[PDB]
Amino acid sequence: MRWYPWLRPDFEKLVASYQAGRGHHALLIQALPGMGDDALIYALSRYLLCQQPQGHKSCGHCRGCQLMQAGTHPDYYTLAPEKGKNTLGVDAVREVTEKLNEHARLGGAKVVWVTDAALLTDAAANALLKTLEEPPAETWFFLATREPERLLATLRSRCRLHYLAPPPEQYAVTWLSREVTMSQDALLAALRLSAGSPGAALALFQGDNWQARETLCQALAYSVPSGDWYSLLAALNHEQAPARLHWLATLLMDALKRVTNVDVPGLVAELANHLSPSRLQAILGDVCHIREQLMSVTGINRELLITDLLLRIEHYLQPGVVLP
Amino acid sequence: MRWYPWLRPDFEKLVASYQAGRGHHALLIQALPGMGDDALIYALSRYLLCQQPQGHKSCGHCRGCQLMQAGTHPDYYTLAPEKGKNTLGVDAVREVTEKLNEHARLGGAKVVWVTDAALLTDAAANALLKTLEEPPAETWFFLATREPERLLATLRSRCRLHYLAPPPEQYAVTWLSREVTMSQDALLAALRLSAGSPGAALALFQGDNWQARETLCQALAYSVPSGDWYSLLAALNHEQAPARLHWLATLLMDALKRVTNVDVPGLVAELANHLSPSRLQAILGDVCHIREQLMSVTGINRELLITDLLLRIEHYLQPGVVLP
Ligand SMILES: [Zn+2]
Ligand SMILES: [Zn+2]
């Protein structure tokens, strides 16, 4: 968790509303990963659970802050998928909502943080909704998501959406330049690959990721002129395949614009030069569809999905083939 | 970690010294567990690594604070026994000291926190010493211990000792009364058992501990009149035997005062009534000696140590036995 400098505008805007009573019991924060919704929700949680706030800040001394620092505040709740699963069950939710019906142990506010409302199960989201439609006194809910479209529809309409928008690109590049030492086109590229999220753009430079993209890039440099796309399996067959497929989709889409990958105009050119627009699009549609298949229910056998993808792509390159 | 209210006096005293340049590069903090030396050392670490301190506080916005919040500051070091061991090896130390010889990544201060200087190995402490005798520029070390007597002697003389003294008993009882709901003699007892450490006194009320003492207490109520001391094995044979032996020692010592266990004057009386002072002392000396044996090198077979202890005790109760 980190307090990024672009969070202030949003923080002061939301915090003031809770302070002046214009706060919603259900705040749905929309944000890309690495934008700091977690730090924002925490700073707001800390403010509300501060028994003696100093302006918009938590004091860091009162007992409430002491129990928060310790991680033992009885009135603060966290709903995250049990480390054993990848979704959020109904028992966990109800278990927290049931307790939300008792008078707050420290006699003040109660705060509930749903880490990713998308992971909620259909019965869990349905149970949360019931609580949201009849909010227990002095309870403040914070639900965060990357894509609110992936949420139980009825849940979305009971929350006030606050979109945590990325800061200006130029500001983000500079921030990044301070976190790592790289050519600025690579930074801007990482940033565009991340949809403007500076934290996620920084995660790419930390470890496996940046090198993985180069390997992919090197692998594409061979597949394009050779027509051998199945050879890409190594660079894509890995846990983080969904992100790796995004990179790919991103290059194809750049090749179709006669720009996200500003650091590799060479390969974008090679793609736009050797592949017809009809094929760049057919390949792009397929890549995006498999990307989703891998994220919706990572087909128990991911390598099959990908190999078939690479073979459909090679089928596309053939003269006389109908592209659909 | 928790910012206890009794820490302020010490915090402001130390922080002011670093601010006015009267700070020692090697601060050895002496404190009982649960006194908050960890929170104190952290607040001081945070102050020194704040690139834009506001008085004595860290700002919580500058990049240094951001990396600390994230737990990624390259100039902050932590030396704790690797989770796989119960001591602190030489490789870990040197590994940090070697890096302490490079110019600080963020160009400011460097902070090293030795969690428990007692756990240092003889070669590790000896290596730390070498660094302490020739402190690298702008580096601040914080070593904490429960008993400075258990440290490499040469290490102790290169550090400024700051004893984090427990707050007044009356203040500690009241603080505790706010953390738990118990009869105040039990609080004061827990507190005295903890040597005045309010955090450690609170840990006794959290789980296994308080019930474990009652079980021990109930077990003593039977052993005293029956002379059957081996029957205490169940109540004492457990991971936390050293603390459990302390409780015992504490009751014997109270029985010898013709008061730490203020909540159970009944059992203290029964002890002082049925056991002669010569035996209370012989039993007390043995208990304390086994306690240490269990903490110095928890005799691979702890249950043997304890059973022999209980049998020596029964031997003591016999008419005509020389007590030594
Ligand atoms: Zn507070
Ligand atoms: Zn700062």
From Swiss-Prot, chains A, B:
Chain ranges passing through the membrane: none
Assigned EC number: 2.7.7.7
GO cellular component terms attached to this protein's record: DNA polymerase III complex; DNA polymerase III, clamp loader complex; replisome
Reactions catalysed according to its record: DNA(n) + a 2'-deoxyribonucleoside 5'-triphosphate = DNA(n+1) + diphosphate
Molecular function GO labels: 3'-5' exonuclease activity; DNA binding; DNA clamp loader activity; DNA-directed DNA polymerase activity
SUPFAM superfamilies listed in its UniProt record: P-loop containing nucleoside triphosphate hydrolases (SSF52540), post-AAA+ oligomerization domain-like (SSF48019)
Keyword Nucleotidyltransferase: yes
UniProt record, GO biological process: DNA replication; DNA-templated DNA replication
Claim: Nucleotide-binding is one of the keywords in the record: no
Keyword tags: DNA replication, DNA-directed DNA polymerase, Nucleotidyltransferase, Transferase
Record's subunit section: The DNA polymerase III holoenzyme complex contains at least 10 different subunits organized into 3 functionally essential subassemblies: the Pol III core, the beta sliding clamp processivity factor and the clamp-loading complex. The Pol III core (subunits alpha, epsilon and theta) contains the polymerase and the 3'-5' exonuclease proofreading activities. The polymerase is tethered to the template via the dimeric beta sliding clamp processivity factor.
Role of this protein: Part of the beta sliding clamp loading complex, which hydrolyzes ATP to load the beta clamp onto primed DNA to form the DNA replication pre-initiation complex. DNA polymerase III is a complex, multichain enzyme responsible for most of the replicative synthesis in bacteria. This DNA polymerase also exhibits 3' to 5' exonuclease activity. The gamma complex (gamma(3),delta,delta') is thought to load beta dimers onto DNA by binding ATP which alters the complex's conformation so it can bind beta sliding clamp dimers and open them at one interface.
Protein's recorded name: DNA polymerase III subunit delta'
Organism of this sequence: Escherichia coli (strain K12)
